[PDB]
Design a protein around this nucleic acid. Structure first.
Ligand SMILES: [K+]
Ligand SMILES: [K+]
Ligand SMILES: [K+]
Ligand SMILES: [K+]
Ligand SMILES: [K+]
Ligand SMILES: [K+]
Ligand SMILES: [K+]
Ligand SMILES: [K+]
Ligand SMILES: [K+]
Ligand SMILES: [K+]
Ligand SMILES: [K+]
Ligand SMILES: [Mg+2]
Ligand SMILES: [Mg+2]
Ligand SMILES: [Mg+2]
Ligand SMILES: [Mg+2]
Ligand SMILES: [Mg+2]
Ligand SMILES: [Mg+2]
Ligand SMILES: [Mg+2]
Ligand SMILES: [Mg+2]
Ligand SMILES: [Mg+2]
Ligand SMILES: [Mg+2]
Ligand SMILES: [Mg+2]
Ligand SMILES: [Mg+2]
Ligand SMILES: [Mg+2]
Ligand SMILES: [Mg+2]
Ligand SMILES: [Mg+2]
Ligand SMILES: [Mg+2]
Ligand SMILES: [Mg+2]
Ligand SMILES: [Mg+2]
Ligand SMILES: [Mg+2]
Ligand SMILES: [Mg+2]
Ligand SMILES: [Mg+2]
Lengths: 68, 89, 106, 245, 126
RNA sequence: UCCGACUUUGUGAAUACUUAUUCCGUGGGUCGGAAGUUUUGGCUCCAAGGCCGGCCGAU
RNA sequence: UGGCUCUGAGGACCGACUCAGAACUGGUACGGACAAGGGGAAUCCGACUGUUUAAUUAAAACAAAGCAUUGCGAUGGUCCUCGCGGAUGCUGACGCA
RNA sequence: CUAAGGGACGGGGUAACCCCGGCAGAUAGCGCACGCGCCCCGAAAGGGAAUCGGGUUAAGAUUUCCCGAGCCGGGAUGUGGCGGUUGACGGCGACGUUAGGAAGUCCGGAGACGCCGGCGGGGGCCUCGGGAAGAGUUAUCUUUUCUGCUUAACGGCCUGCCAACCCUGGAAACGGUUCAGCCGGAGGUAGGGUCCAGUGGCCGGAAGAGCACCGGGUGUCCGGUGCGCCCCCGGCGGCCCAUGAAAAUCCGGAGGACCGCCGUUCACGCCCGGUCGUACUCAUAACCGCAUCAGGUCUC
């Protein structure tokens, strides 16, 4: 497993062809976005409520999205 | 202190006879002594094995006597070899 | 106090069977098998450690398993000779070569 | 009777030498053109211990005369040799301790070790620690040389035989009392299966000619013919005299 | 007094250890950034290769090429030689540095073709 | 196991020879005759060059 | 030599054990179970540590360090093998037997 | 894979069975015509490609099944990046950065090593306290007694022990320093740095798991201490007429023949992974002692 820091790098990874699904995990602190790729699971931590929503709406329409 | 005559040989206790302990004393002392290194100029040469004498700091290793760095005949042989070499010329 | 068992069929405390105790998220203690301590690269003329390279088992240095910066040092005789050894060889190579010319002239 | 212990050693079953941790044969480099006509320089890289051998060995590296290769040698170290020292082998090598020379190049009185008996033997004489041979005289007609061996015997050798200058390192080893059966046990543990010796008088007659009796006694002369069969040849063999003079 | 511009040295440490270089400027006392004495040198990162008659014309043009590096070196990391190479160099950014390297490459390639300074272009063997 | 005879066992001078036989060494790497590298614990190979694939360099 | 109530000393950037001292007190009991040398004066033998007759002998027997003697310079000594060959020997008298 | 060792082609011996492996015999082949050229077997305790946590059965899995998360080896193939001063930059330097030519030939290291004694470090365990959850005792006392309060391989960043190394500088009125040592003009003390290892810290994995409670919900927290015990590591000292394996395998280096739209040990991406063992006992009843035998039988 690997962590992603900036939002844009998560955007390109979720747009990868080998990306299969995105899991959204809600914690009491932040919101974790996990995209399952071929070799690694990439996790990005969003500490902002609206940035989580903007990320949710701006995801690629072709990728599956799951709520955890 | 701690002993009047035994010295290093007191590790053997009362065993083996007084004459044998006195015999081994000189070689026990000499083989555990620190010798002068002609290459670097320090008293850092220690016996690594019988005949092998290595300096701690400069790292030179030298073939010498069994229980002393230079045997008496080694000095005599070197002088004979040196005199033969010069007189050969 | 949660005594432990070996996890494979090796029953003898050999150097290749060394274990460590770890706590799992299951709240218990299990054995994990470790790797034997390995020397790193060594210098042949000084005997000292070669700086800049990790101490691994020989097959952990394999190219597919280790990055190139970790494997090498950027200097002639990089992972083979230390810096002091390389300096001495350069100076010896040049100074003896000058003596060869002086022998030729004289 | 049964086969005596002296006979059983020739089968070499449990009496073979212990050589598992030995560093290799110690001997000169094979005689070649460069040594026969000039000199060749090698450098001493290590002075090491050989199990079962009192004398230290010297690791020496040469450059191969015609191949692009290193040539690593290992012979008995003369006293005074050291790591990083240049040694020279051959007809034109200087008379210095640690150098290997033909006997023709060593004047009368020189101290030598690892002396060849045949030209190209790589060293046969005076190899144990602290031992050496002395050059006595030279014969230019026959091309032979006279040397004195450590046992005192004179020997005639070809003048082309090679020897190292100096005496063998590690001398004085046997002046130290062993003091313990255990020290003797460790000495012979790396040599052979020979150390704890049982006296023949302490045996039964089936096992030894000295065995038996209601007292421990040989019962016949311990001096024995040179031509006695094995099993019979025990005690003092072909002795010209006995006792302490 | 033998560490002057135009004098040839040998680098003893670093990435360019064992390479031959020429001094360009000497800061004998040292700057404020570098208290120790040091000099700017121009050295050979890649020596011109062995050029022989049997070779074809295109190939010998490729073997005559050199690469040059610029480096500030402590005096203690330099082996000063007795040789001298003068090519009138008289010398910050990653673009100014590489451009200045290319100028010295042209001058040093031209000196090598002249046939002089055979020691300077013939590597060291250790 | 020592010792003698025969066999292996030949050749030529008034004891010599060498090819049988025997032993030793080498990755069978400079043998016979003639002609004309001591340096400091560094590197050293697959020829530069010259002259007509060829010769010298490397008798 | 117990119990109890204290006292002093020894530190780090609030702490841990140890060691000394005192008073009081019990049917003189206190290393309260457990755990845990009997000592001395001599004679014989073997120096000592080690070893041994598995299943009647552990010893004064064997070994041992030390001392001494013998053979042997490799075309050798000692020994094995029907034979060819082999052990010592990756050895060379400060060595092997 | 090799160890002690065993077998064995040719050759030698032998009536044959069979006994001999260094006695050297055109050695039976390897790279790119050209070049080079000094058999096998033998260890489920030696060496060694790569896995973790949680769950699951009447019986398995102390790593094989399920869930999730990785890794190794091999093979094809792109997309992006990287280099052309043809074969990258930075640093005085130790050295750093995911990339960043190359053939025959040659060189080094790791693998890779004894016993004993202190000292230091890390992990686990034990132990003292605080908080919260539940349980025990409760004539009296007891802010009390008990239980639990967890965090894997793998990846990134930080840290950086004890040694080792680098730069400046130049020491007697000698200093630095360990439990012990010991160290210094062959450059100390000091100042500033590089590297090394970790079973160290934080984040990802990962709370969604597991556990404990209450009926879906709550919680899974904060400290202290040590000649403590077990394992591992580090670094010194001692000892030897004792000096305490080898090979497979892997990495690095010297050289630079040869070569340009071709190179690329980089990232991401695609495919594949054979055979045999695996239950159970391991002992006062699963083994041997004629037995369900007070014996014997190697370990954590
Ligand atoms: K590195
Ligand atoms: K018999
Ligand atoms: K024995
Ligand atoms: K005896
Ligand atoms: K008798
Ligand atoms: K023999
Ligand atoms: K195995
Ligand atoms: K081992
Ligand atoms: K692992
Ligand atoms: K199983
Ligand atoms: K039983
Ligand atoms: Mg008897
Ligand atoms: Mg008899
Ligand atoms: Mg009496
Ligand atoms: Mg006794
Ligand atoms: Mg006893
Ligand atoms: Mg017994
Ligand atoms: Mg009995
Ligand atoms: Mg009895
Ligand atoms: Mg006596
Ligand atoms: Mg094999
Ligand atoms: Mg073998
Ligand atoms: Mg046969
Ligand atoms: Mg096998
Ligand atoms: Mg194993
Ligand atoms: Mg089971
Ligand atoms: Mg001790
Ligand atoms: Mg400092
Ligand atoms: Mg986490
Ligand atoms: Mg939960
Ligand atoms: Mg234990
Ligand atoms: Mg290179």
């Amino acid at each position: 497993p690997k962590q992603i820091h900036e939002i844009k790098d998560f955007l390109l990874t979720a747009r990868r062809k080998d990306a299969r699904s995105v899991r959204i995990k809600r914690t009491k602190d932040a919101v974790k976005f996990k995209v399952r790729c071929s070799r690694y699971l990439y996790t990005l931590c969003v500490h902002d409520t609206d940035k989580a929503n903007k990320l949710k709406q701006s995801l690629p329409p072709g990728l599956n999205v799951q709520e955890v | 202190k701690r002993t009047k005559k035994a010295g290093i040989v007191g590790k053997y206790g009362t065993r083996y006879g007084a004459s044998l302990r006195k015999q081994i004393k000189k070689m026990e002392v000499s083989q555990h002594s620190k010798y002068f290194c002609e290459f670097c100029g320090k008293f850092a040469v220690k016996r690594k094995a019988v005949g092998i004498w290595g300096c701690k700091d400069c790292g030179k290793v030298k073939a010498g006597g069994a229980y002393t760095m230079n045997t008496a005949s080694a000095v005599t042989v070197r002088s004979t070899i040196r005199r033969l070499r010069e007189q050969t010329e | 106090v949660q005594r432990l068992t070996y996890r494979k069929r090796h029953s003898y405390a050999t150097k290749s069977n060394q274990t460590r105790v770890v706590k799992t998220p299951g709240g218990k203690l299990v054995y994990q098998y470790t790797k034997k301590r390995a020397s790193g690269p060594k210098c042949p003329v000084t005997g000292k450690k070669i700086q800049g390279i990790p101490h691994l088992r020989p097959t952990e240095y394999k190219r597919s398993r280790l990055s190139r910066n970790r494997r090498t040092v950027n200097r002639p005789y990089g992972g083979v000779l230390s810096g002091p050894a390389v300096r001495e060889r350069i100076i010896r190579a040049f100074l003896v070569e000058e003596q060869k010319i002086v022998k030729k002239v004289l | 009777g049964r086969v005596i212990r002296a006979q059983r050693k020739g089968a070499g079953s449990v009496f073979k030498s212990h050589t598992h941790h030995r560093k290799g044969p110690a001997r000169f480099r094979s005689l070649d053109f460069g040594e026969r006509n000039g000199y060749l320089k090698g450098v001493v890289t290590d002075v090491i211990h050989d199990p079962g051998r009192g004398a230290p060995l010297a690791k020496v590296t040469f450059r191969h005369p015609f191949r692009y290769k290193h040539q690593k040698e290992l012979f008995v170290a003369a006293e005074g040799m050291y790591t990083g020292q240049f040694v020279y082998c051959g007809r034109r090598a200087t008379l210095s301790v640690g150098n290997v020379l033909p006997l023709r190049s060593v004047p009368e009185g020189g101290v030598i070790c690892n002396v060849e008996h045949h030209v190209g033997d790589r060293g046969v004489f005076a190899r144990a620690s602290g031992d050496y041979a002395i050059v006595i005289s030279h014969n230019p007609d026959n091309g032979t040389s006279r040397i004195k061996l450590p046992s005192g015997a004179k020997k005639i050798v070809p003048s082309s035989c090679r020897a190292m200058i100096g005496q063998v390192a590690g001398g004085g080893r046997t002046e130290k009392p062993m003091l313990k059966a255990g020290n003797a046990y460790h000495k012979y543990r790396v040599k052979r299966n020979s150390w704890p010796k049982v006296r023949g008088v302490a045996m039964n007659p089936v096992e030894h000619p000295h065995g038996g009796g209601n007292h421990q006694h040989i019962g016949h002369a311990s001096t024995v013919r040179r031509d006695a069969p094995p099993g019979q040849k025990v005690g003092l063999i072909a002795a010209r005299r006995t006792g302490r003079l | 007094k033998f560490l002057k511009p135009g004098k040839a040295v040998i680098l003893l440490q670093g990435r360019f250890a064992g390479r031959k270089a020429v001094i360009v400027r000497v800061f004998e006392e040292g700057t404020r950034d570098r208290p120790y004495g040091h000099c700017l040198v121009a050295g050979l990162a890649k020596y011109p290769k062995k050029v022989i008659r049997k070779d074809s014309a295109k190939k010998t043009a490729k073997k005559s090429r050199v690469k040059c590096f610029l480096k500030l070196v402590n005096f203690t990391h330099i082996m000063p030689t007795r040789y001298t190479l003068d090519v009138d160099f008289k010398d910050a950014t990653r673009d100014k540095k590489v451009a200045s390297c290319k100028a010295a490459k042209a001058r040093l390639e031209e000196r090598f073709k002249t046939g002089k300074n055979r020691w300077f272009f013939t590597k060291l063997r250790f």
